[PDB]
Design an enzyme around this catalytic site. Structure first.
Site, PDB file in Angstrom:
ATOM      1  N   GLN A 171       2.966   9.823   2.037  1.00  0.00           N
ATOM      2  CA  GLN A 171       4.295   9.212   2.111  1.00  0.00           C
ATOM      3  C   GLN A 171       5.186   9.700   0.987  1.00  0.00           C
ATOM      4  O   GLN A 171       6.448   9.479   1.050  1.00  0.00           O
ATOM      5  CB  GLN A 171       4.260   7.683   2.108  1.00  0.00           C
ATOM      6  CG  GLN A 171       3.353   7.085   3.183  1.00  0.00           C
ATOM      7  CD  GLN A 171       3.440   5.608   3.102  1.00  0.00           C
ATOM      8  OE1 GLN A 171       2.501   4.977   2.629  1.00  0.00           O
ATOM      9  NE2 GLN A 171       4.643   5.020   3.483  1.00  0.00           N
TER      10      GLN A 171
ATOM     11  N   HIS B 125      -4.373   0.664   7.607  1.00  0.00           N
ATOM     12  CA  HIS B 125      -3.017   1.216   7.720  1.00  0.00           C
ATOM     13  C   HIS B 125      -2.772   2.432   6.790  1.00  0.00           C
ATOM     14  O   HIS B 125      -2.159   3.402   7.209  1.00  0.00           O
ATOM     15  CB  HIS B 125      -2.054   0.061   7.356  1.00  0.00           C
ATOM     16  CG  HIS B 125      -0.619   0.447   7.263  1.00  0.00           C
ATOM     17  ND1 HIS B 125       0.344  -0.090   8.094  1.00  0.00           N
ATOM     18  CD2 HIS B 125       0.042   1.243   6.387  1.00  0.00           C
ATOM     19  CE1 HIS B 125       1.513   0.452   7.809  1.00  0.00           C
ATOM     20  NE2 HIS B 125       1.366   1.228   6.753  1.00  0.00           N
ATOM     21  N   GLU B 126      -3.140   2.333   5.501  1.00  0.00           N
ATOM     22  CA  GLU B 126      -2.905   3.457   4.578  1.00  0.00           C
ATOM     23  C   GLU B 126      -3.832   4.579   4.972  1.00  0.00           C
ATOM     24  O   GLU B 126      -3.427   5.733   4.946  1.00  0.00           O
ATOM     25  CB  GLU B 126      -3.082   3.074   3.110  1.00  0.00           C
ATOM     26  CG  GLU B 126      -2.216   1.904   2.611  1.00  0.00           C
ATOM     27  CD  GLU B 126      -0.715   2.043   2.957  1.00  0.00           C
ATOM     28  OE1 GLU B 126      -0.238   3.171   3.176  1.00  0.00           O
ATOM     29  OE2 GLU B 126       0.043   1.055   3.028  1.00  0.00           O
TER      30      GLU B 126
ATOM     31  N   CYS C  23       6.324  -0.622   6.949  1.00  0.00           N
ATOM     32  CA  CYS C  23       5.933   0.619   6.338  1.00  0.00           C
ATOM     33  C   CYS C  23       7.141   1.125   5.585  1.00  0.00           C
ATOM     34  O   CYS C  23       8.206   1.257   6.169  1.00  0.00           O
ATOM     35  CB  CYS C  23       5.484   1.659   7.404  1.00  0.00           C
ATOM     36  SG  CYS C  23       4.668   3.140   6.674  1.00  0.00           S
ATOM     37  N   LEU C  24       6.939   1.586   4.344  1.00  0.00           N
ATOM     38  CA  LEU C  24       8.062   2.158   3.546  1.00  0.00           C
ATOM     39  C   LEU C  24       8.677   3.434   4.103  1.00  0.00           C
ATOM     40  O   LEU C  24       9.773   3.744   3.719  1.00  0.00           O
ATOM     41  CB  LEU C  24       7.697   2.355   2.064  1.00  0.00           C
ATOM     42  CG  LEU C  24       6.922   1.206   1.493  1.00  0.00           C
ATOM     43  CD1 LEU C  24       6.264   1.630   0.170  1.00  0.00           C
ATOM     44  CD2 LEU C  24       7.955   0.087   1.402  1.00  0.00           C
TER      45      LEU C  24
ATOM     46  N   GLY D  30       0.897  -1.185   0.000  1.00  0.00           N
ATOM     47  CA  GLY D  30       0.000   0.000   0.000  1.00  0.00           C
ATOM     48  C   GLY D  30       0.907   1.198   0.000  1.00  0.00           C
ATOM     49  O   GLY D  30       2.060   1.089   0.436  1.00  0.00           O
TER      50      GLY D  30
ATOM     51  N   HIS E 198      -2.289   6.926   7.525  1.00  0.00           N
ATOM     52  CA  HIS E 198      -1.465   8.036   6.926  1.00  0.00           C
ATOM     53  C   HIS E 198      -2.218   9.318   6.625  1.00  0.00           C
ATOM     54  O   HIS E 198      -1.661  10.402   6.771  1.00  0.00           O
ATOM     55  CB  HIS E 198      -0.808   7.575   5.654  1.00  0.00           C
ATOM     56  CG  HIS E 198       0.356   6.703   5.923  1.00  0.00           C
ATOM     57  ND1 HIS E 198       1.377   7.136   6.718  1.00  0.00           N
ATOM     58  CD2 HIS E 198       0.671   5.435   5.560  1.00  0.00           C
ATOM     59  CE1 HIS E 198       2.292   6.183   6.831  1.00  0.00           C
ATOM     60  NE2 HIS E 198       1.893   5.151   6.136  1.00  0.00           N
TER      61      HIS E 198
END
Ligand SMILES: O[C@@H]1CSc2nc3ccccc3n21
Ligand SMILES: O[C@@H]1CSc2nc3ccccc3n21
Ligand code: NA
Ligand code: NA
Lengths: 170, 170
Positions: free
Chosen positions: A51, A141-142, A99-100, A46, A145
């Protein structure tokens, strides 16, 4: 075009993102295209626009096969604007997340097992789906953000937080 | 001899360490010497034995000048076995911490401003000191290692947790 993924500690991950108002446009399409490309080169499942330091209620996600979650069912490739989420039950479930923007680390995080999410495809057609399990967990999760929240503030068991090459929790 | 510093996620950071029972011996001296050497090559201000996978109630710490805390007063070079800690007031204080087992990251962590700590030098002479501020914070932090605790489980404001090259919180 692949964009820089900004890292935990940047204030731009911490903002409440405004709505997307350019559905169906060329600019949104190019942004969404950048996000899939960026998600893909970093091996994400995702990616949320903040991000990439783009302050909008937008995320992309999905895959057939994940290098990082070699155990997980396919989640459909999806771009989602103006996401709204509702739990369809109170069953919580633990699972591993990374997470990236937090490279190298992972933790166990509780999320709703069942949700519905709603919003819009980049062409403006509406999207509503029930999701369960990993699909659900990605979207929740996304979504965090888009409200300025990362997974560490969701950890309940800090024994499970550590580097991905070193952890051996079950 | 410089030892591997094990990284968050290793179960060996999570244990309750037993007491040191070899005060004044050659084996403890060599271990303590390894710990100062290891602390020094990694630019640490404190290092607890479990961070080198040695399951003992032991830590070393101190410095004149810190690369990472270029703002902080000198803390005396100290090796401390069987540390016991008591707050001398309830004033809490926020400050930045990082950790050699959690490379690249830092967070703001509340700790007691004032403590006393007690234990033994490696030759067996007793140590008791009052400490305040950064000196205190080092000792409380290295002590948490000896009980299987890392700083993330102490964070109250997750806006302050992020990578050291990226953070801009005050
Ligand atoms: O570690 C991966 C890379 S990107 C991402 N978004 C996620 C949401 C939920 C669980 C895991 C992930 N991950
Ligand atoms: O980031 C450094 C490297 S090692 C260490 N032990 C600590 C205890 C308290 C505050 C900071 C530190 N740090
Ligand atoms: Na915020
Ligand atoms: Na433990």
């Amino acid at each position: 075009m692949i964009r820089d993924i900004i890292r935990m500690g940047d204030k731009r991950l911490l903002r409440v993102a405004p709505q997307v108002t350019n559905l169906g446009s060329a600019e949104l399409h190019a942004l969404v295209s950048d996000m899939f490309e960026t998600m893909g080169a970093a091996h994400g499942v995702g990616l949320a626009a903040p991000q990439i330091a783009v302050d909008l209620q937008l995320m992309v996600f999905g895959f057939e096969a994940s290098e990082r979650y070699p155990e997980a069912p396919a989640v459909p490739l999806t771009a989602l604007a103006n996401a709204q989420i509702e739990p369809l039950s109170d069953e919580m479930e633990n699972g591993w997340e990374g997470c990236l923007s937090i490279p190298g680390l992972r933790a166990v995080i509780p999320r709703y097992r069942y949700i519905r999410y709603r919003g819009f495809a980049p062409d403006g057609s509406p999207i509503e789906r029930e999701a369960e399990g990993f699909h659900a967990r990605v979207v929740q999760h996304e979504y965090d953000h888009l409200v300025g929240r990362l997974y560490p503030s969701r950890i309940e068991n800090f024994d499970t937080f550590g580097f991905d090459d070193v952890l051996s929790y079950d």
